[PDB]
Design a protein around this ligand. Structure first.
Ligand SMILES: *[C@@H]1O[C@H](CO[C@@H]2O[C@@H](C)[C@@H](O)[C@@H](O)[C@@H]2O)[C@@H](O[C@@H]2O[C@H](CO)[C@@H](O)[C@H](O)[C@H]2NC(C)=O)[C@H](O)[C@H]1NC(C)=O
Ligand SMILES: *[C@@H]1O[C@H](CO[C@@H]2O[C@@H](C)[C@@H](O)[C@@H](O)[C@@H]2O)[C@@H](O[C@@H]2O[C@H](CO)[C@@H](O)[C@H](O)[C@H]2NC(C)=O)[C@H](O)[C@H]1NC(C)=O
Ligand SMILES: *[C@@H]1O[C@H](CO[C@@H]2O[C@@H](C)[C@@H](O)[C@@H](O)[C@@H]2O)[C@@H](O)[C@H](O)[C@H]1NC(C)=O
Ligand SMILES: *[C@@H]1O[C@H](CO)[C@@H](O)[C@H](O)[C@H]1NC(C)=O
Ligand SMILES: *[C@@H]1O[C@H](CO)[C@@H](O)[C@H](O)[C@H]1NC(C)=O
Ligand SMILES: *[C@@H]1O[C@H](CO)[C@@H](O)[C@H](O)[C@H]1NC(C)=O
Lengths: 73, 369, 369, 369, 73, 73
C-alpha cells in the first residue's frame, strides 16, 4: 500500500485498497427435522431418553414462540 | 470210620465258616451305611446346587438385564445428541438470539452448502471466486432468520451478501487540525473529508467512519447502508483543499487543538501551545520530541506517540502466547474371564470316577455270578 | 459205606459253601471300593461346585456391582445436565458475551414468564396486545444483564422495552441526486430529509438511517436513541420542496452523480453523463434502457438495474432449498435368560436317584434280618 | 455213631446254606443302590456342568458386553469433559464465523486475563482500574480465529489498553427552547449534545449517548466515535451567546414538544397544543406542567406525559423469580449373595463323604479278619 | 402499504407503516439455583459426576468475575 | 453526582463522571489442542466415542474454512 502525507491540509490519504461492494441478497431456506428414535420398552416410566425427548420437545415449543410468521404460533 | 472223619472235618469246617459269614454280615451292614451316608452328602449337594442356580437364574440375571437396560437407555440419550447435533445446535442459536442470527454460522449452513450457493449466485466468474475466497466475510456479512417451527421441523432462512462490484480502487482519509499562528492568535482549518472512499461506476462512494468498512488484506468490505454517493471530482480535495472545482468539506476554528490521529501506515500529530508532544518506542519513553505544528510519522518510525502524559500506541502490542492440551482420555475396560480349562479338568475327573465306581460294582456282580 | 454216602455229601456241600463265602468276601471287597470311588467323585464334584460359587459370589457380582455403580455414575452425570439445563444454558450465555446478553434468550426468560411480565407492564391494554404478538421483537429489542454469582446461585436481570406509543402514522423517505443541466453546467439537488419518519404527539420523530427502524409487516420498531425530533411541518417537503413554511433540508452540487437508491417497493435511478443505465428481468436480459435523468421503477416492474457493468438487485434472489434429517436412533437391548426347565427336571432326577438308592440299602438291611 | 455226625453236618450246613444266599441277595441289592446313586451323581454333575456352561459362556459374555458399553460411554462423557474449553471455544468461533463479540470466559480465563492486563504497557493505576472493571475489558475486546492446523485451534485475543483514566467527564442533553411574542415562534436548540471527556491538550466529544458506557462513575468511551473539540467549547454551558466559541445551535420557526431524558432527571418541552403532565407510578397525575421548558428530577416524579403518551423517567422494576432444578439421585442397588447358609451345606457335604469313607474302611477292616 | 414517487425532488415516500415506539424499560430479576445431587459413595474418587460438578463449580467461579456489582467478587 | 439545569438553553449538564479511554490494543495468542483419546477396540463398529471424535473432527474441518489466514485452508 502507499500512504501519502498531505502537508497542506494536515491529512493523510492511504490508497491501494480494492473494493468489495454488496449489490444484493441471495437466500437459501433450510428444513431441519429430528431423526426417528426407537421406543425403549425395556424400561418403565422415567427413562433418560424420554426425559431427553420431552426436553427437546419443549425446547421446540418455546422456540416456536419466536417464529417469523404469526401463523406458526 | 472214614465217614466219621470226613463228616468230622465237615462239621469242624462249618464252625470256621460261621465266623467268616458273621464278619461278612457285619461288614455289609457297614457298607450299606456308607452308601446311605454318601447319599445324604449328594442330596445336600443337590439342594446346595439348586440354590446356586436360583441365584444365577433369578437374582443375578435380573441385575444384569437391568444394567443391560440402563446401558441401552444411556446409549440412546447420547446417540440422540450425536445423530442430531446440527438440529440441536441450530435450535440452540435461534434461542440464544430469539429468532435471528448475527452471522451465518457453521451449523446454519455447512461449507459445502455455502460454496454451492455462492457458485449459484447471479454474478460474474471473478466475483464468485472472490466470494469463495473470503467466505468467512460472506458468512459474517450475512445472517439467519427463523421462519417457523412446524411440528417437529425447524424451518429457517440464510441470507447471503452478493458481492457484484469488486476490485475497484479504494482509499481512506485521515486528518488532524492544521493550525497556523500569526502574532499570538491561532487560525485553524480541519478537513471533514475523513473516511472511506470507494470508486464505483458513475460515482464515488464515501463511508464516513473507519468502522463502516472492514479490511481483510487489500480488500475493503463496505457497508452499503453507510455509503454516501459523492462526485468523482471530490478526489481533487487531496491535492488542493482550496480548489474551486469541488466544494471541499473543511471547517475552520479560532482555537488550537492538539491531538493524535492514527493512519493505516502511520499517525498524524498536532502539537500546539502548551503541550509536550513526543514520539516514543516500546522500551524507551522518548526518542524524539515533536515540533509544534502538524507532524506525520510512520509505524516504522516509532511505536508510540505521547501527548503530555497520555501515551498513544501506533501498533497492536504483542503479549504472551499460550498453548493448552486437554487431559488424556483413557479406557476403563477390564473384562472378566472364567477359568474353564481348570474347571473342566475337575468335571472330567468326576465323570471318570462315576464310570470307575460303576465299573467296580460290575466286577462285583461278575464275582457273584 | 452207608454212612459215607451221607457223610461224603456234607463235606462236599461244605466245600461248595466255603468257596461261596470267599467269593462274596471278594465281591464285597470290590463293592466298597466302588462306594469309596463314587465318594471321591462327589468330593471332586463338590469342590467344583465350591469353585463355581466362589466365582459367581465373589469375582462375578464384583463385576456386576461395579458396572452397577458406573451405570449410576453416568445416569447422574447425564441427569444433572438434563435437570439443570436452564441454569447451564444461562451460565453459558453470560460467559460467551461476558456478563451481558444481546437478547432476552429463551433460556433467560421463558415464554410463560415473558408473557406474564408484558401483561404487568405499566401501559394501555392495546399496547400490551401488540407486544404479545411481536414478542420476538420485545426479546431482541430488550436484553439481559448478569448481576452476580452468589455462592452457587446465578442472579441476572432481563430488561424489556415498554412500547408506549403504537399504531401512529409512519413513513420513509428515499432520494437520489436530481441533477439538471443547461449548456454543460450541472445543477444538482439532493434531499437531506432522507430516512424514517414516525408521527408522534406534538412532534414528528425522524430517524436518519434505515437500519434505525426494524420492519416486521406494517409495523416499524424504531430505536429511541436514533430519533431526532422535527417539527411536523417538515412533512410538507413531500408536496412542495420549495415551501417557505419549512426549511426543507436540500444540498446543491455542481457535478453529476449516477446511482441507484432502493425503496421498499422500488428504486430511484440517476443516469447522467457517461453511464449505461438499463433495466433487466428474471429470464430475459434487457427490457428497457433508461433515459438520462431521474427514473423511478417498481419491484413489479423489474428485478434489475444495471449501471455500466454493475448489476443491482431490487429484491431478494431466491436460491436453493434444503432439507436435512438426522440419523435414526435405535435400541440395542438383548436380554439374557437361563433355560431353567431342562435343568429343573434333571435335579428332580437326582433327588429321585437318591431316593431309589436310599430305599435299596433298606431292602438290603431287611434281607439281612 | 458215624452216621449221627453226618446228619448234624448237613443240618448246620443247611442252616448256613440259606443264610449266605440271603447275604448274596443282600449284596446284589446294595450293588444296585450304588449303581443307582451313581446314575444320580452323574445326572447332578451334567446339570452342574450346564450351569457352568451358562455362567462361563452366556453370562460373563453379557457382563463383558455391558462392561464394554460402560467403558465406551465413560470415554464419550470424559472426552467432552476433559475438553470443555477446547469444545466451547470451537463452538463460539463457529456460531459467529471466525470472530467473537467479546473475550469470553472460555477464550481467556480470569487468571490469563489478569496476567495480561498486568503486563500491559501502562501505569500502576491504569492496570488497577482495568483489573477492577475487567468485565468491560472483555466486552470492549474481541477474539479472532487465526487458523485450524490439523487438530489444533490457534486464535488471538485482542484487549483494550485503557491508558487514559480518571479525567473529568460530563454529558449534555437539551430540548428545543421555543420563545413566543405575538403568536410567532422563535426556537433555538443546542446541537452540542453528547458525551465530553477531557484529555491532555484537548476535549473529546462523543456525539451519541450510546458511544460511552456507564459503570458507576466511570465512563468507557469508544475511541472511534470520538471527535476532538477546543477546550473552550465547555463555555457553552454558561452563556450560549458566548463569542469565545462558535456555539453549535440550531434555530427554528416551529414549536417542538418533547421529552429528553437526563441521567438524574428529564427536560420537558410543552408548547402549543399538548397536555404535558407529571405523574407517578403509585399516584396517577401529580402536576400539569406550564408551557415552556421544564426540568424535573428522577426523584421529583416517575413519569412525564405528553397528551396520551406516557414517558418513563426510570426503569420499572417488575416481578422477581427464583428457580431450582430437579434433584439428581443415585440408583445404586448392589446385589449380594446369601453365602453363610450355603457354605454350611458344603461342609455338610464334605463330612458325609468322609463319614461314608470312614465306613468303607471299617467294612474292609472287618473283612481283613 | 403505498409508495409515492415525487418527481420534482427525485425522492420517494412510502406510507402506510405503523409505529412501535419505546417509552421505557421494564425489568425482572431472576435467581437460578443448581439442583441437589446425592453423594455417590459407591465409587472411590474420580466419578464422572464429581468431575462434572467440580467443572460447573469452576464455571461459576469464573462467571463470578464479570458480575455487575463489585460486592459479589 | 451533580446535574445542573441551564434554563437559558433549555439544557442539562451532568458532571462528576470519570474517563476510561482506549489508547491501544494488547494481544495474546492461544493454541488449544484436543487431548489424546485411546482406541476402544473391545467393541465392534459404531462406538459412541468413535462417532464423538468423527464429530469433533468434522467440526474442525468446517471451522478451518473460516480461519483468518488463507494458508490454513
Ligand atoms: C411550490 O411552492 C413555491 C412557493 O410557494 C410556497 O407555498 C405557498 C402555499 C405559499 O405559502 C408561498 O408563500 C410559499 O412560498 C411556488 O413558487 C413561488 O411562489 C411564490 C409565492 O410566494 C411566487 O411569488 C413565485 O412566483 C413562485 N415561483 C414560481 C417559479 O412560480 C411554486 O409555484 C410551488 N410549486 C408547485 C408545483 O405548486
Ligand atoms: C483404531 O482401531 C481400529 C481397529 O484395529 C483393529 O483391531 C485390533 C484389536 C487389532 O485386531 C488390529 O490389528 C486391527 O487393525 C483400527 O484399524 C482399522 O481396522 C480395520 C478392521 O478392524 C482394518 O481393516 C483397517 O485397515 C484399520 N484402519 C486403518 C486406517 O488401518 C483403526 O485404524 C484405529 N484408529 C486409529 C485412529 O488409530
Ligand atoms: C490551490 O488552488 C488555488 C486556485 O484554485 C483553483 O485550483 C485549480 C485546481 C483550478 O481549479 C483553478 O482554476 C482554480 O483557480 C490557487 O490559487 C492556489 O495557489 C493553489 N494552492 C496550491 C498550494 O497549489
Ligand atoms: C478372582 O478373585 C480373586 C480375589 O477375590 C483373585 O485373586 C483371582 O485372581 C480372581 N480370578 C479371576 C479369574 O478373576
Ligand atoms: C448361549 O450361547 C450359545 C453360544 O455358546 C448359543 O448357541 C445359545 O443359543 C445361547 N443360549 C442362551 C440361553 O443364552
Ligand atoms: C433375591 O430375590 C428374591 C426374590 O426372587 C428376594 O426376595 C431376595 O431378597 C433377593 N435377594 C437379594 C440379595 O437381592
Amino acid at each position: 500500500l502507499k500512504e501519502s502525507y498531505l502537508e497542506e491540509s494536515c491529512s493523510t490519504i492511504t490508497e491501494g485498497y480494492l473494493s468489495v461492494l454488496r449489490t444484493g441478497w441471495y437466500t437459501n431456506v433450510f428444513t431441519l427435522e429430528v431423526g426417528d428414535v426407537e421406543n425403549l420398552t425395556c424400561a418403565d416410566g422415567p427413562s433418560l431418553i424420554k426425559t431427553e425427548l420431552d426436553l427437546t420437545k419443549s425446547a421446540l415449543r418455546e422456540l416456536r414462540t419466536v417464529s417469523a410468521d404469526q401463523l406458526a404460533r | 470210620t472214614a465217614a466219621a472223619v470226613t463228616a468230622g472235618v465237615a462239621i469242624a469246617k462249618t464252625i470256621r465258616l460261621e465266623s467268616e459269614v458273621t464278619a461278612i454280615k457285619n461288614a455289609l451292614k457297614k457298607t450299606n451305611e456308607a452308601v446311605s451316608t454318601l447319599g445324604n452328602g449328594v442330596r445336600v449337594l443337590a439342594t446346595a446346587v439348586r440354590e446356586l442356580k436360583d441365584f444365577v437364574s433369578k437374582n443375578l440375571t435380573r441385575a444384569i438385564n437391568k444394567n443391560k437396560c440402563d446401558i441401552a437407555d444411556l446409549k440412546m440419550a447420547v446417540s440422540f445428541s450425536q445423530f442430531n447435533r446440527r438440529f440441536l445446535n441450530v435450535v440452540r442459536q435461534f434461542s440464544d438470539n430469539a429468532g435471528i442470527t448475527p452471522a451465518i454460522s457453521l451449523d446454519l449452513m455447512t461449507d459445502a452448502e455455502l460454496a454451492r450457493a455462492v457458485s449459484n449466485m447471479p454474478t460474474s466468474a471473478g466475483q464468485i471466486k472472490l466470494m469463495l475466497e473470503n467466505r468467512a466475510m460472506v458468512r459474517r456479512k450475512g445472517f439467519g432468520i427463523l421462519i417457523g417451527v412446524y411440528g417437529s421441523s425447524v424451518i429457517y432462512m440464510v441470507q447471503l451478501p452478493i458481492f457484484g462490484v469488486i476490485d475497484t480502487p479504494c482509499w481512506i482519509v485521515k486528518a488532524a487540525p492544521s493550525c497556523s499562528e500569526k502574532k499570538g492568535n491561532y487560525a485553524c482549518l480541519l478537513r471533514e473529508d475523513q473516511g472511506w472512499y470507494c470508486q464505483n461506476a458513475g460515482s464515488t462512494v464515501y463511508y464516513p467512519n473507519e468502522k463502516d468498512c472492514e479490511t481483510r488484506g487489500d480488500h475493503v468490505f463496505c457497508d452499503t447502508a453507510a455509503g454516501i454517493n459523492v462526485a468523482e471530482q471530490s478526489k481533487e480535495c487531496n491535492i488542493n483543499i482550496s480548489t474551486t472545482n469541488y466544494p471541499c468539506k473543511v471547517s475552520t476554528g479560532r482555537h488550537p487543538i492538539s491531538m493524535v490521529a492514527l493512519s493505516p501506515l502511520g499517525a498524524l500529530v498536532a502539537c500546539y501551545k502548551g503541550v509536550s508532544c513526543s514520539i516514543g518506542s516500546n522500551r524507551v519513553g522518548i526518542i524524539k520530541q515533536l515540533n509544534k505544528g502538524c507532524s506525520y510519522i510512520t509505524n516504522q518510525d516509532a511505536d508510540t506517540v505521547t501527548i503530555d502524559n497520555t501515551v498513544y500506541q501506533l501498533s497492536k502490542v504483542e503479549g504472551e502466547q499460550h498453548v493448552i492440551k486437554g487431559r488424556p482420555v483413557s479406557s476403563s475396560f477390564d473384562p472378566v474371564k472364567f477359568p474353564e480349562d481348570q474347571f473342566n479338568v475337575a468335571l472330567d475327573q468326576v465323570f471318570e470316577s462315576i464310570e470307575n465306581s460303576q465299573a467296580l460294582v460290575d466286577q462285583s456282580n461278575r464275582i457273584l455270578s
